[PDB]
């Protein structure tokens, strides 16, 4: 049908306000929910409907700053929320030592990303601390963990690391050569990229891999033309109407971005079928509450609302800003980020 | 011990054993963002979890508290980490924890934290004896669960349990020849055992795949496997493959087959073959067949491939 723009604006506004007891499982990643909402409003050019200053303070209260004795550097970055009970402190005083308080790579990523979207200049971000924290998360094989205490490691976090380094315009946060090696090793026999070596290639990991390389500005250098052609073939084969994440799996709205954005970075999204993709995405639109779902006649959520919108953006939907396919922010925001980086170099 | 939905459940704020602890509340400051509303019971468990966490109390009561915190939110990675700290400090029976996590995962098979927890346990115990069967059960409710397959590959590689996997793969492919995860497992097993350099193995595999393709010709997974194990050897180096596929075209045609042929023809052009301009024309003919009638949704893609072939071989 048609794109219910205002309905989605309200949907995102609601997400920023209060969530029902049944979303408790997102408690530790509330910052990524905020990102979906803010970046989503940004994409719809409606950031005006929120108080950028309040949200900026909230985000800064999530930053894990180094302590007086700088003994917790390997644990700096951003928290997903205040679930640990640390007193509200919008990156003012130093860090109040806590046995289990550390950052989470996906939160440091969405956190910085949110700050940039809200117009903040990142002056209150302890860049060196975050980078030190990032470095500590990388494993021998080049991939990353999410927290210093330990977690699973895969392509998802390689992408987070890349985004962080890119936004802080400093790649000392990772051993790029090893990360690139991990990305190459994840390529499957079917030519898509998997979460790790030997695993089933997947639209999500293929996006994370390709986008990371583009952020590093090494796509061409890492993959040969023949290789890129094979990857392109795998990616464009994901379109059924909407896109699925793996061969023989049902389509899901969010892949219109994961795969679509990858195709965009590979310069062949232009050859996909726009109409069927757009029609599928809209068929998952919740005309009553707003937002999008993974499947039609299914309940909407912040993740699919945001990616469905970004998916539409890839085809320049009337009313939606163009999304930067590798950074996962509006081109406008990526532009402001360029000015920011430039401004720093003085 | 005391279940969260038991008639006699008592808030921690009313338990004598917890009187000495001061609960620590969560505070999102003056203007909270994406704030989740919590029931009295929920907030009560976590207000005490924060207290115990903040003091790094390695107690038996804290251990029991994590069980509740986990029931309320199994996705809280910090809770799982602390529980692991406690498992060590209190030297708890890890075989018992295995039963616990086994039940937790069955109820939440798509949670990252629970699979990570089980992996740490198996590493601690250096015992993979229950793994393959447990995973097979999970794969029974969802044969494509990415977490399950990832865990299965880790177990097999870490403890070298390759002996029966190829047979397991054969069984699952019979249940659903379209399961892309199983085809990936097959390649995982083979390339990590015999490898594909043994012409006898390659032949067995190519023949096996063609048999599967004949059963269900429209299966991207089967075709991707076939092309995957041959693309690096050089598709044009197998003259009988080209004609066997051309023979299938009559009845068993599908966009995957046409695409394969196009790829064969391209390899030939890439290797200065004989009748170059003739081969190129055979390819272009197929590219258009795909665009115009066999894989129309990718119409612009196939034509883009065609233009690429012409400007590269003329």
């Amino acid at each position: 049908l048609d794109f219910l723009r205002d309905r989605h604006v309200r949907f995102f506004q609601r997400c920023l306000q209060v969530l029902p007891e049944r979303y408790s499982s997102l408690e530790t990643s509330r910052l990524t929910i905020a990102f979906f909402a803010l970046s989503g409003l940004d994409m719809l050019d409606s950031l005006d409907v929120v108080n950028k200053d309040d949200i900026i303070e909230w985000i800064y209260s999530l930053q894990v700053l180094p302590t007086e004795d700088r003994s917790n550097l390997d644990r700096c970055g951003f928290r997903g929320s205040s679930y640990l009970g640390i007193p509200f402190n919008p990156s003012k005083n130093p860090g109040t030592a806590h046995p289990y308080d550390s950052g989470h790579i996906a939160m440091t990523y969405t956190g910085l990303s949110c700050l940039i979207i809200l117009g903040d200049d990142l002056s209150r971000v302890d860049k060196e601390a975050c980078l030190a924290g990032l470095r500590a998360l990388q494993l021998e094989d080049g991939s990353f963990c999410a927290v210093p205490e330990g977690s699973e490691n895969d392509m998802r976090f390689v992408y987070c690391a890349s985004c962080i380094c890119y936004m802080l315009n400093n790649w000392s946060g990772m051993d790029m050569k090893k990360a690139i090696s991990y990305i190459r090793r994840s390529m499957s026999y079917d030519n898509g990229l998997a979460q790790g070596a030997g695993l089933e290639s997947h639209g999500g990991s293929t996006f994370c891999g390709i986008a990371s390389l583009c952020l590093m500005g090494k796509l061409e250098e890492v993959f040969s033309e023949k290789e890129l052609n094979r990857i392109k073939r795998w990616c464009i084969m994901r379109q059924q109407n909407g896109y699925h994440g793996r061969p023989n799996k049902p389509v899901d709205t969010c892949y219109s971005f994961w795969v679509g954005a990858t195709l965009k970075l590979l310069k062949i999204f232009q050859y996909t079928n726009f109409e069927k993709n757009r029609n599928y995405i809209l068929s998952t639109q919740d005309r009553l509450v707003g937002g999008f779902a993974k499947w039609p006649d299914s309940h909407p959520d912040a993740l699919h609302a945001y990616f469905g919108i970004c998916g539409l953006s890839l085809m320049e939907e009337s009313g939606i800003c163009k999304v930067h396919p590798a950074l996962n922010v509006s081109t406008r925001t990526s532009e402001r980020l360029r000015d920011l980086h430039q401004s720093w170099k003085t | 011990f005391l279940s969260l939905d038991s008639p006699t459940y008592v808030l921690y704020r009313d338990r004598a054993e917890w009187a000495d602890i001061d609960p620590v509340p969560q505070n999102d400051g003056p203007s909270p963002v994406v704030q989740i509303i919590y029931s009295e019971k929920f907030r009560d468990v976590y207000d005490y979890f924060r207290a115990v966490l903040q003091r790094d109390e390695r107690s038996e009561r804290a251990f029991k508290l994590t069980r509740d915190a986990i029931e309320l939110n199994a996705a809280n990675y910090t809770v799982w980490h602390f529980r692991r700290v406690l498992l060590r400090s209190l030297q708890k029976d890890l075989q018992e924890e295995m039963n616990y996590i086994i039940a937790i995962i069955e109820e939440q098979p798509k949670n990252y934290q629970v699979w990570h927890h089980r992996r740490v346990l198996v590493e601690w115990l250096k015992d993979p004896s229950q793994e393959l069967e447990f995973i097979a059960d999970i794969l029974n409710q969802d044969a494509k669960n990415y977490h399950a397959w990832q865990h299965r590959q880790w177990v097999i590689q870490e403890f070298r349990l390759w002996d029966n996997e190829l047979q397991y793969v054969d069984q699952l492919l019979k249940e659903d020849v379209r399961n892309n995860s199983v085809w990936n497992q097959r390649h995982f097993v083979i390339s990590n055992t015999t490898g594909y350099s043994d012409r006898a193995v390659l032949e067995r595999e190519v023949q096996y795949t063609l048999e599967m393709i004949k059963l269900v010709p429209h299966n991207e997974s089967a075709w991707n496997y076939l092309k995957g194990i041959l693309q690096d050897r050089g598709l044009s180096r197998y003259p009988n493959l080209l004609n066997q596929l051309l023979d299938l075209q009559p009845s068993h045609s599908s966009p995957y087959l046409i695409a394969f042929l196009v790829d064969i023809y391209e390899d030939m052009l890439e290797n200065q073959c004989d009748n170059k301009e003739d081969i190129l024309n055979k390819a272009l003919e197929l590219c258009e067949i795909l665009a115009k009638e066999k894989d129309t949704i990718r119409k612009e893609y196939w034509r883009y491939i065609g233009r690429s072939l012409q400007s590269k071989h003329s």
Partner: peptide, 5 residues
């Protein structure tokens, strides 16, 4: 739902 974390 799609749990990515």
């Amino acid at each position: 739902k799609c749990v990515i974390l």
